[PDB]
Amino acid sequence: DTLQLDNFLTTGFLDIIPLSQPLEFRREGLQHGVLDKLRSGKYPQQASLNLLRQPVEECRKMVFSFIQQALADGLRNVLIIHGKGRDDKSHANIVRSYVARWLTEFDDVQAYCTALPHHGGSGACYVALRK
Numbered sequence: 001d002t003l004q005l006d007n008f009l010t011t012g013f014l015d016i017i018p019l020s021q022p023l024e025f026r027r028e029g030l031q032h033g034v035l036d037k038l039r040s041g042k043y044p045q046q047a048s049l050n051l052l053r054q055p056v057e058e059c060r061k062m063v064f065s066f067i068q069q070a071l072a073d074g075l076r077n078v079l080i081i082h083g084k085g086r087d088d089k090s091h092a093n094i095v096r097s098y099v100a101r102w103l104t105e106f107d108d109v110q111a112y113c114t115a116l117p118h119h120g121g122s123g124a125c126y127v128a129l130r131k
Contacts, residue, residue: 022114038126041077048079084123
């Protein structure tokens, strides 16, 4: 069910991430190789989610639906594109901050981190997904 009544992603009391802080998250108890999955992973177009100029509620529906889809298709890593902001309260950084929280709310998300520049750099993040 990518029915939105099942959308457990939360809003409110957003913990805004400063522009000087990258996106990084790693669950305890992962296998030795998981993090190289982030770096040396394959990110084709269908493994990526483009959130540029999407309102926050639309981002919440897309991320939920996209991660459900990616898991159903056996994707082990995905790219999320939120964009680069000019200040902490710009839309891109608000989106980035919500994406940071939402990814930790999925049981099957192992880790994430800021992308390399050839995958959008500080405007995107790599996400490791449990197979």
